[PDB]
Structure 1
Amino acid sequence: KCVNFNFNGLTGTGVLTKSNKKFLPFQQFGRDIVDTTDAVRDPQTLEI
């Protein structure tokens, strides 16, 4: 659903979906080729 979100201080508006990206154990969020956030790690479940 289109929601507003705040993940451990990272804020924005968007639709959250299950991701197939595999983050390293320490990484909390990701960015695309133009440095705009496009993925987050849920701080409670660690799902990407």
Structure 2
Amino acid sequence: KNKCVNFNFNGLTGTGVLTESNKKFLPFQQFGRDIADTTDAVRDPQTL
């Protein structure tokens, strides 16, 4: 956390910084994007 890392998802590629969040995703959804198609929050597959 809190470092410029390169996350490697099964269907998503890109770099970013992982940190804490205040949102709450749905139990079936895994992705989260901004208005102009910008992925800014994903759910961790290991820990909910």
1:14 to 13, 16, 20: 16
- Does the 8 Å CA contact 1:4/1:12 hold for their aligned counterparts? yes
Instruction: List structure 1 runs of 4+ shifted beyond 2 angstroms.
Output: none
CA apart distance, 1:8:
3.1
Q: TM-score, normalised by structure 1?
A: 0.82
* Unpaired runs of at least 5, structure 2: none
CA-to-aligned-CA distance 1:17-48 (integer Å, 9 cap, x gap): 111111011110100011110101111112xx
Larger proportion of strand: 1
Question: Which has the higher Rg, Structure 1 or Structure 2?
Answer: 2
Distance in 1 of aligned mates of 2:45 and 2:13: 13
- Structure with bigger RCO (C-alpha 8 Å, 6+ apart): 1
Superposition TM-score, scaled by structure 2 size: 0.82
Percent sequence identity over matched residues?
96
Unaligned runs of 5+ in 1: none
